[PDB]
DNA sequence: TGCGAAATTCCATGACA
DNA sequence: ATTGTCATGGAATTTCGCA
DNA sequence: TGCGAAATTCCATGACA
DNA sequence: ATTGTCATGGAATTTCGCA
């Protein structure tokens, strides 16, 4: 069998609804399966339109062979099926109520949820401007298994933003107070 | 009078050759040279004669001399003519240079992706969805290009676009020309916050941004072809042009910009499959070898009459946007430092220190 | 299928080398070449494959081939690629030429004064006494120049000025570019009434009016110098510039335009007195000898990759004022007649006969 | 003594007042002494201003060493003396009531008067437009003495407008009828 | 160890306002 | 304190297929 | 029949929108 | 049915002044 490579399989999913941030409510998460590299796109809804708009930006940089997702409405629509067929993208779906991807991707989506939650508290309407630094943090995070960051596996070089001071990712006691109040 | 008095009676003065007869006629000293009988004016009158002849049409060396030689002769006339040409301010700042710039430098290709971005604006273009301009961002090592449509070539549209771009990676250096969008303090603030060094071209010299300028040509050329026989609706085509050019082979390199950035083609038409059996680490090892071994051009031969700058030399900067019937050159300035054979610092006509390309300089004539 | 069927079982087909093993896999004919395993498509699929690869970014020969070679191999691929490049209309009309024009002609200097005038307009300039333009009239043989200020580059201002000029003498020929003032029927009427043949440059090629264009440079350069540190009040200076340039020596000729026209200087500063003892008939005899023996340049060497036009060749005229994101070249046209190595008649894109300079032509690529 | 040359001596004089022709009433006549070449300039008055204006056009083509004239007011003014001194032109005056120049110039001014009169009759307000063809006729007229036209002596070539059909210059009987009526 | 043709490399040309 | 670039297609050169 | 310096000629460069 | 041109100042070459 052939070794796993970047652009073989993008894993997509929606996070939301979130509090409004400059008119945006959701985040389309795209994770490359091999490298673990993450792209994040803010959208106003979990619709096919918003997915096609966000993925058109991504697919003007690089096109995946396969897109994997759960059976969410936006991904199972025939409009998204025609969009994928035009670009030669095979669509792949997990069984309903059994979302399965891969250990590296599961742990990556876990990091994204917790990293967002830690920065949502205190400034819950300002996450649109923080999406760039969130991606840089995720993509320059060390991988225990592969022993390389997503940035290193995708580009084959060290980064100019190494996040050496690893964030705790858990919430402090004071951040639980303002989180439980809201 | 004193020098010319000894000449008439027959004594020898240096400069005046002995074999000609110097006589007096109509109160003026003359001499019978092969061209004809010419007047020898005294030393004190000669600067005025050269100035009168020159100022007729502000002529150069030979054209000025041919006027003076119709009436006069004296030792080393062209030396006195060249002396006045170097003092005529109008000629120094109006006349053209007849010495070419020295041969161009071909700076080293940046070693890694995201070491140096080159950014620039295209436009204005025909309105498309209310957009008039395109921000072009070219990675120096790979040539991988990002395109962003904007409504103006502004700092706010540049910051908006680069925040989306830098979601993928931060560059060490961003090179740009001295356009208003890039020279603003708001942009310098944005770059310092992210650890990005802003590098600027010498003024009025797009060759220095040549990496992105050359990419602008391909962007416009492909847009032109796709819009043949159609209205110029280019906003929708920028994603297509971006993807198409990033996956286009450079014949001399044998690689596409996508391949130089990622080391493997994505799911695009005619994707390369030569590294299908290699692991990613084996693939990235081959990519690092490919990046270092790319073709790089060398400095071409100098033209036969080029000049290279020297410290202390009198040079003149080209006027940027010269008005009608106004000089094309500034007043003479001095070369303080030679940064490279093509770039110098000068003591500006205002008094400031100014870093300029020698393409916008001429060496002041007549020393 | 038919050609590829015999290939699989082992028979020889011309073009396909014998030393490689051609096998079937996944319903497709393949071959194990040193670069890798490539698919051999049937003859009927190849034109579509080349077109798909080319249309990605409308790439030239090598960049298109490198895409096709990632997946496919067949005999003489570049021949099929070049075949499609010559049929792609978008590439033919958008791409640049990489062949320079042949070396410039240096036409003979007119034999006599008033054989050929070269006329042209300078402007618009800063308003001076309500005047914005300058009509420049250069005698081809002598270089003697007449200057007239006008409010517009119009036929009526041209006729007014030339009626005053032709009080001194009528010329045989008047050369001009295809500007509106000179191409009007009112001007052709004015010229036919006086026995003057109107000669016109090829369109969009000021080199052809180079005699007067070069004189425009000297007119503007002297005006610039005289107006340094002053408001641009150039109307009063035109008589001064006219007289100054007409009495300025050309170093290569050793004569002023005044001297070539009259054979004797007038009462101007530094007037030449070499023919003071000759009669006028002796003076005019020496003038006729000087006029015939003037220096004349020759055609320079051709650049290493120039082209010269041939009858029947496919060529493309440059678009005059091309809009943004629109092609720089017209559709291919045919060379009817070769007037000289630098000038041709073509069967225009509209259908007309058009006389053009080869500087505004490229040879259509890929035959 | 030195042989006579062009630009040695311009002879100037006014003809007028004439009937109005596009606002002009007089003609400044300039004749080169050696060649016989003639320049004609229309003016609104025989003033120093009109002379200086017309001669500034001529002296931007060629400057004479000497200008000769009668003692007319415009030529004897100190403004015209300063104008001539600035250009290095020596002014030369004939004695009052004894206008003397040279045989060639006298016969040339005679031709100009008679050639104008012959074209004035019939169209007396249209002489402004005819001044170009009048000059060409005068300057391409054969000289009995020198056996060359003024054009030939000035430029050293044949002309593109040779006036081979020599005009009679005298008035016909019908032209005397319309002349004597006015 | 050498030939004819195909494939590859060379590089002048021109345009990015 | 900074610096030209590179797609293009005929031509020149090298490699291929075969002997 | 030869030297050093002055004078002359050569010509690449650039700009005429 | 039409076509580049020529001032400019360092450099290269020739001529001059003297022996
Ligand atoms: N004129 C500009 C060009 C241009 O002329 N390109 C043609 C060109 C010619 C030769 C070459 F080799 C490549 C090449 F692209 C340009 O490309 N850019 O991007 C500009 N960007 C901004 C401004 C605004 C005034 S500025 O003072 O900021 C300044 C002046 C000149 C340059 C840069 C910045 C002008 C230009
Ligand atoms: N653009 C014109 C130039 C010009 O660009 N000169 C720059 C130049 C460049 C190179 C060179 F070697 C010499 C040179 F002077 C020009 O000089 N003139 O006189 C023009 N006269 C009229 C018109 C109007 C449109 S046209 O269709 O009548 C037409 C277009 C082009 C040329 C002539 C006539 C334009 C121009
Ligand atoms: Mg989901
Ligand atoms: Mg710019
Ligand atoms: Mg630019
Ligand atoms: Mg014109
Ligand atoms: Mg012009
Ligand atoms: Mg009188
Ligand atoms: Zn000057
Ligand atoms: Zn094409």
Alpha helices, DSSP H, located in chain B:
2-9, 43-55, 61-71, 77-85, 89-94, 155-165, 180-183, 185-193, 210-226, 238-246, 257-262, 280-292
* Best mutation target, C167, C246, C256, to test chain D (most D CBs within 10 A): C167
CATH class of the structural domain C97-104+303-364 = mainly beta
Cβ neighbors of B72 (< 8 A, separation 6 or more) are: B38, B39, B40, B41, B49
A70 has binding-site annotation: yes
Cross-chain CB nearest to B284 (options A60, A156, A161): A156
Report the 10 Å Cβ neighbour count for C105: 13
D58, containing H or E segment: helix D48-58
Exposure string of B120-133, with b = 16+ CB inside 10 Å and e = fewer, is bbbbebbebeebbb
Q: Taking the CA of residue C306 as centre, how many other CA atoms within 13 Å lie in the half-sphere pointing to its CB?
A: 15
Indicate yes or no: CB of D5 within 8 angstroms of CB of C195.
no
CB of C269 within 8 Å of a chain B CB? The answer is yes
C-alpha to C-alpha distance for C222 and C242, rounded to whole angstroms: 10
Q: Nearest Cα to C283, choosing from C294, C275, C291, C271?
A: C275
The Cα–Cα gap between C129 and C224 comes to: 18
Tokens 């004190």 appear where? Answer: B44
- Give me the CATH number covering residue A89: 3.30.420.10
Strands of the sheet with C314-317, listed across from one edge? C353-357, C343-347, C333-340, C314-317, C361-363
For residue D152 the two structure tokens come to 């030939």
Q: CB-side exposure of C363: number of CA atoms within 13 Å?
A: 17
Residue whose pair of structure tokens reads 């005397």 in the numeric block: D176
Report which protein residue has its CA nearest ligand 1's atom 6. Answer: B206
For D126, the token pair is 């249209």
Ligand 2 neighbourhood includes C90 CB (under 6 angstroms):
no
State which residues form the domain around A28: 1-182
**Cβ contact C216 with chain G strand, < 7 A:** yes
- Which of C240, C265, C277 comes nearest D2 by C-beta? C277
Give nearest nucleotide to C116 (CA–C1'). H3
Pairing of strands C353-357, B100-101: unpaired
Q: Are A78 and A107 in contact (CB under 8 A)?
A: no
Q: B233-241 contacts: CB < 8 A, separation 24 or more?
A: B233/B128, B234/B125, B234/B126, B234/B128, B234/C325, B235/B128, B235/B129, B235/B131, B235/B149, B236/B128, B238/B134, B238/B147, B238/B148, B238/B149, B239/A56, B239/A57, B239/A60, B239/B147, B240/A60, B241/B147
Residue C221: closest CA among B92, B204, B63, B98: B92
- Ligand number, closest to the Cα atom of B214: 1
Q: How many domains does chain A have?
A: 1
Q: Which atom of ligand 1 is nearest to the CA of B201?
A: 33
Given CATH 6.10.20.110, say whether it is the number of domain B249-294: yes
CATH number of B4-96: 1.10.340.70
A67 CB within 8 Å of a chain B CB: no
Is the preceding peptide bond at D17 cis, omega within 30 degrees of 0?
yes
Check pocket membership of C224 for ligand 2, CB cut-off 6 A: no
- The set of long-range contacts for D58-62, using a CB threshold of 8 Å and a minimum separation of 24, is D58/D30, D59/C243, D59/D87, D59/D89, D60/C239, D60/C240, D60/C242, D60/C243, D61/C242, D61/C243, D61/C246, D62/C258, D62/C262, D62/C266, D62/D7
Residue count of chain D: 182
Environment class of D97 (CB within 10 Å of its CB; exposed 0-12, middle 13-18, buried 19+): exposed
Reported as type and span, the H/E element at residue A181 is helix A173-181
Minimum CA–CA partner of B60 in chain C: C251
Contact predicate C283/C260, CB 8 Å: no
B115 is in an annotated binding site: yes
Domain layout of chain C by residue ranges: 4-96, 97-104+303-364, 115-248, 249-294
Cα–Cα distance measured from residue C265 to residue C245, given in angstroms and rounded to the nearest whole number: 13
Evaluated on CA atoms B228, B229, B234, B236, the torsion sign reads negative
Instruction: Say how far B18 CA is from H19 C1', in Å.
Output: 14
Q: How far apart are CA B170 and CA C85, in angstroms?
A: 40
> Among B300, B327, B330, which residue's Cα sits nearest to residue B318?
B330
Check B113 against A155: CB less than 8 A apart: yes
Which residues have C-beta under 5 Å from ligand 5, the single-atom ion?
Answer: B 120, 213
Which helix (DSSP H) or strand (DSSP E) does residue C255 occupy? none
Q: Are D55 and D48 in contact (CB under 8 A)?
A: no
> Going along chain C, which residue ranges are E strands?
22-25, 28-33, 36-39, 100-101, 116-122, 133-139, 145-150, 173-176, 197-200, 306-307, 314-317, 333-340, 343-347, 353-357, 361-363
Contact C224 B251 (CB under 8 A): no
Dihedral sign computed on CA atoms, order A60, A64, A68, A74: positive
Identify the CA nearest to B362 among candidates B136, B124, B69, B94.
B94
Question: Using CA atoms, how far apart are residues B344 and D155, in angstroms rounded to an integer?
Answer: 55
What is the Rg, in whole angstroms, of the alpha carbon atoms belonging to chain A? 17
Among protein residues, the one with the nearest Cα to ligand 1's atom 3 is B206
Q: Measured between CA atoms, how close is B162 to chain C, in angstroms?
A: 25
Pocket test for ligand 2, best of C201, C206, C218, C360 (most atoms within 8 A of CB): C206
Cα(B304)–Cα(A99) distance, rounded to whole angstroms? 73
Q: The tokens of B87 are what?
A: 């003092």
Whether B214 and B245 have beta carbons less than 8 Å apart is answered as no
CA distance D121 to D114: 11
Chain C residues touching residue B68 (CB < 8 angstroms) = 270
Using CB atoms, which residue from B125, B226, B270 is nearest to C68?
A: B270
Whether B341 sits with its Cβ under 7 A from any strand E atom: the answer reads no
Centroid of ligand 5 to alpha carbon of B204 (angstroms) = 11
Search chain C and give the residue with CA nearest D84.
C267
Nearest protein residue to the C1' atom of E15, measured from CA: B217
Fold of C115-248: Nucleotidyltransferase; domain 5 (3.30.420)
Give yes or no for a contact between C241 and C219, defined as CB atoms under 8 angstroms apart.
yes
């Amino acid at each position: 069998d052939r070794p796993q490579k970047p652009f073989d399989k993008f894993f997509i999913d929606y996070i939301g609804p979130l509090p409004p941030s400059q008119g945006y409510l959701y985040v389309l998460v795209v994770v490359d399966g091999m490298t673990g590299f993450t792209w994040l796109y803010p959208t106003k809804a979990p619709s096919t339109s918003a997915t096609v708009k966000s993925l058109n930006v991504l697919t003007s940089i690089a096109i995946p062979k396969v897109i994997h997702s759960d059976q969410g409405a936006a991904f199972t629509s025939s409009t998204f099926a025609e969009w994928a067929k035009e670009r030669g993208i095979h669509l792949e779906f997990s069984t309903p109520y059994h979302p399965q991807s891969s250990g590296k991707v599961e742990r990556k989506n876990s990091d994204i949820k917790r990293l967002l939650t830690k920065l949502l508290v205190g400034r819950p309407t300002k996450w649109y401007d923080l999406l760039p630094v969130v991606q840089l943090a995720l993509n320059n995070t060390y991988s225990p298994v592969l022993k390389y960051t997503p940035h290193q596996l995708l580009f084959g070089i060290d980064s100019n933003t190494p996040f050496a001071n690893q964030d705790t990712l858990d919430l402090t006691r004071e951040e639980e107070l303002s989180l439980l109040q809201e | 009078d004193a020098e010319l008095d000894q000449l008439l009676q027959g004594h020898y003065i240096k400069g005046y050759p002995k074999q000609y007869t110097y006589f007096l006629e109509d109160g003026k000293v003359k001499v019978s040279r092969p061209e004809g009988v010419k007047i020898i004016p005294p030393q004190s009158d000669r600067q005025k004669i050269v100035l009168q002849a020159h100022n007729l049409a502000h002529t150069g060396r030979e054209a000025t001399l041919l006027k003076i030689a119709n009436l006069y002769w004296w030792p080393n006339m062209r030396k006195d003519v060249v002396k006045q040409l170097g003092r005529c301010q109008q000629c120094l700042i109006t006349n053209a240079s007849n010495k070419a710039s020295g041969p161009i430098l071909r700076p080293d290709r940046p070693q890694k992706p995201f070491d140096k971005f080159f950014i620039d604006y295209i436009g204005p273009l025909p309105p498309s969805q209310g957009y008039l301009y395109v921000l072009v961002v070219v990675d120096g090592m790979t040539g991988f290009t990002w395109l962003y449509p904007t409504k103006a070539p502004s700092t706010s549209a540049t910051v908006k676009s680069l925040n989306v771009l830098t979601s993928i990676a931060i560059p060490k250096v961003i090179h740009s020309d001295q356009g208003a969008a890039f020279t603003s303090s708001t942009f310098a603030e944005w770059a310092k916050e992210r650890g990005i060094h802003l590098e600027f071209s010498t003024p009025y010299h797009p060759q220095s941004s040549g990496k992105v300028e050359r990419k602008n040509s391909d962007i416009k050329r492909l847009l032109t072809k796709l819009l043949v026989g159609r209205p110029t609706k280019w906003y929708d085509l920028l994603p297509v042009v971006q993807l198409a050019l990033n996956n286009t082979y450079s014949p001399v390199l044998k690689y596409t910009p996508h391949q130089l950035l990622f080391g493997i083609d994505s799911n695009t038409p005619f994707a390369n499959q030569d590294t299908l059996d290699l692991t990613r680490e084996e693939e990235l090892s081959l990519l690092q070898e490919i990046r270092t071994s790319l073709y790089h051009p060398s400095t071409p031969p100098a033209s036969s009459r080029s000049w290279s700058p020297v410290v202390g030399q009198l040079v003149q900067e080209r006027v940027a946007r010269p008005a009608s019937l106004r000089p094309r050159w500034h007043k003479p300035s001095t070369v303080l430092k030679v940064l490279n054979p093509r770039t110098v610092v000068i003591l500006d006509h205002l008094g400031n220190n100014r870093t300029v390309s020698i393409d916008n300089l001429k060496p002041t004539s007549h020393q």
